Amino acid sequence: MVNNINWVKLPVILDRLLRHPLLTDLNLETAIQYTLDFISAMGLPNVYVDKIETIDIKEYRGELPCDLISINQVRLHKNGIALRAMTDNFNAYPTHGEPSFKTQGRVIFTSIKHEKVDISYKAIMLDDEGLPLIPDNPIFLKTLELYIKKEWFTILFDMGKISPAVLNNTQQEYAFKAGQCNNEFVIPSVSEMEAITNMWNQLIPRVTEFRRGFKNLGDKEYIRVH
Amino acid sequence: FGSGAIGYEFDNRYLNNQEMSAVAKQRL
């Protein structure tokens, strides 16, 4: 992403929506739900807060943080070796290898009995109130505005309180701004293209940056001169 | 005698129906 994620409070979107006379029954309560829906539907990883938090494994099981949404990595605390996805169907079940993990709810199922594991996860940036905090990018703001307007107009169209042409226009505009917002947050910046370039050109390919925390992924590959 | 309750609402409904036809002919 080229631009920086400067955070602003949620009613910034209600400042802009309520300019429309047909959206004056919208509320913070509705904006919260539709904002969370938009955040998930776009799935942008720059909108989440990166956190690292250690936990203990009692026996092939560990308690997971409260605010976790998605895991970047899990690794062993003492070695630093990363874990992979668990493909085993009988992990801690005995009868009569490398470490891996599997997470469903508040519980992470590892293949290790008693160790500390480090989890690098993504959460939502919250407010002084326990509420979501949105980027102030006017592209993001316009796209979220258009998302909420599209949902409200879809309800009102299901009633027959909006013309089909009005909803068709709203859907067209939301679709274009959704694509544009997707490209805004995903296209790398200059530093991210230097990292991608140093990942791309290897005379000797590097294929083991998962073992580390992808630390050396964008490190330049130097060849000595002979 | 007179009373415009049913008359007014039927006229309003007629106007709403040609309203919907007119807007349903609108295309971007």
- The method recorded for this entry reads cryo-EM
User: How many distinct helices (H) and strands (E) make up chain B?
Assistant: 1, 0
Say if CB A113 and CB A57 are below 8 A apart.
Answer: yes
Locate the chain B residue with the closest alpha carbon to A160: B20
- Nearest-CA distance A182 → chain B (Å): 26
Q: How far apart are CA A176 and CA A194, in angstroms?
A: 29
Residue A25 burial (10 A CB sphere; 0-12, 13-18, 19+): exposed
Q: Quick one: closest CA in B to A170, which residue?
A: B28
How close, in Å, is residue B28 to chain A by CA atoms?
A: 7
Query: Which two structure tokens, joined as six digits, stand for A179?
Result: 């694509």
3-state secondary structure of A82: strand
Query: Is the Cβ of B26 closer than 8 Å to some Cβ of chain A?
Result: yes
Torsion angle (degrees, nearest 10) of CA A37, A52, A4, A45: -40
Sort A47 into a burial class: Cβ within 10 Å, 0-12 / 13-18 / 19+: buried
**A44 torsion bin: left (phi>0), alpha (psi -120 to 50), beta (else):** beta
SS percent in chain A: helix, strand, coil, step 5: 35, 20, 45
